[PDB]
Write a protein that binds this ligand. Structure first.
Ligand code: K
Lengths: 306, 306
């Protein structure tokens, strides 16, 4: 209960909890998040779309900004082709239960007045504050190009443009997001989501790699990908399987196993589960077994309506 | 005649003379130079609106580009405001005897397509290669802004846009130009010009703060300005007066002179005068005089034509 808490839940931070308190009181409020069209939609996207839904059920008008432009320039399909990848992402998000408005930056991000403000913003954005923004995202070409410093003021003006009250994004975007706070006349509330550690235990669950779990993958694809997944003893920090637990599973969870090698349990909460894994009583295999079967029932409704 | 040698005249360099030649062969050849609307139009502009004329006389269809947008951005005027300023310059350049095509950057540099290529280009411009470009133009900025490194590519696509065969301009522009040459399908021929020094020897005569002889200056003002001008005997390098001698006076000119101070002289080459001034024969005073009077005769045609 408490719209505040529901939005707050599982977030990594809310730039000004105070400002959100106020936004909520408004009878008309908007929140926007951006997604570049992805071939496969993984738990990483789902984690966030899930958060968008939160704001959805709280009076917020959701806007899912589709970054097809970046794909255009960055040598990838043609816009028409991208539209097709992106309109699939819509079918998925709708599957997740996201009643939002979808836009393609490729319809406003080049228009006259937009470019103008962008340039305008460029006058008040230090080469440094900009670079450090993009620092969180990717590592930084051998020899960096001008486009890299432009990206952040592009994303900035994309928050300004709609005039929304809230911006959602993973923690990679806090720098850019903070630039927006300091540069736009309208300070926007930012809700950042934790990043999701890939299966092999490296970076994010980027589909630009192969350590992800698609919201559509078959019950087999899941069981497989999980049994391989990185998941040490006692260690919870960095543990992919443990995140999947903290952010997607419903409780009270009841994990099984022969009273010979353990004993069936019932972790009414996650902290509860975490503490076990820390105390060692819950072997990595039992966890995977539990998460797998569970994760499967959860992502089930989505695969279905697809 | 050899128009190549005509144009070659008073040019700090012609990036690819051979290419220039290949150009002169064509029937349809065009070139453009760029100017930011200015209140006072001093000899600075003159040195080049002249060269521009040489190329129009070789056949090159002239194109002037009043970068009213840059001017806008730098919190100067308000487009339509600036507009009238540039349109005044248009008149001054016309009162200088230049047939040409006049265009405002604000009318294209903000178009989807144009902006689109700026970004494509942004992926091809290293952060430094971009910075080292502006450095020759206007020093550096304590806390550089993305605007700085965006301008160069903003100028590159400015050569591309019309598809000019040659890009005229000052030497501060050399490094910007190379870029346009290294990043565009064709390799425009760049005829860079000397950079006229201010009457105090501190730099370029800048309409933007001080030292300069504005074309419409009255004989009397010209005399008062040329007199105060830094011009040390024997010193030719740096001396603005001498530059004015070199780039504007027709030879042979008869430097009027006190019978008892050496007596009237008649130089048939700038080299004589140089030789003279260097050897301390032509004292600065007699020099400043022969020059001021001579300028007043050349500018009058333009001055009164207004
Ligand atoms: K509360």
């Amino acid at each position: 209960m408490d719209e505040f808490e529901m939005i707050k839940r599982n977030t990594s931070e809310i730039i000004s909890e105070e400002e959100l308190r106020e936004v909520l009181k408004k009878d008309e409020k908007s929140a926007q998040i951006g997604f570049e069209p992805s071939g496969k939609i993984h738990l990483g996207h789902y984690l966030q779309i899930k958060k968008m839904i939160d704001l959805q059920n709280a009076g917020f008008d959701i806007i899912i900004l589709l970054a097809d432009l970046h794909a255009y320039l960055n040598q990838k399909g043609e816009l028409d082709e991208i539209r097709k990848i992106g309109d699939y992402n819509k079918k998925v998000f709708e599957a997740m239960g996201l009643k939002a408005k979808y836009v393609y930056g490729s319809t406003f991000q080049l228009d006259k007045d937009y470019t103008l403000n962008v340039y305008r913003l460029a006058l008040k954005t230090t080469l440094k504050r900009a670079r450090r923004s993009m620092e969180l995202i990717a590592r930084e070409d051998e020899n960096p190009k001008v486009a890299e410093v432009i990206y952040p003021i592009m994303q900035v003006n994309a928050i300004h443009y709609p005039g929304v009250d809230v911006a959602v994004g993973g923690m990679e975007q806090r720098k850019i997001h903070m630039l927006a706070r300091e540069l736009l006349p309208k300070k926007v509330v930012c809700i950042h989501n934790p990043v999701l550690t890939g299966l092999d235990g490296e970076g994010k669950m980027s589909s630009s790699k192969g350590n992800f779990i698609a919201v559509d993958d078959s019950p087999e694809e899941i069981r497989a990908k999980i049994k391989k997944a990185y998941c040490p003893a006692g260690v919870v920090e960095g543990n992919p399987i443990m995140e999947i637990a903290k952010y997607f599973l419903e409780y009270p969870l009841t994990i099984k196993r022969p009273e010979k090698f353990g004993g069936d349990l019932t972790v009414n909460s996650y902290e509860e589960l975490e503490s076990l894994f820390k105390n060692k009583e819950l072997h990595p295999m039992d966890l995977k077994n539990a998460v797998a079967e569970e994760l499967i029932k959860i992502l089930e409704p989505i695969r279905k309506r697809l």
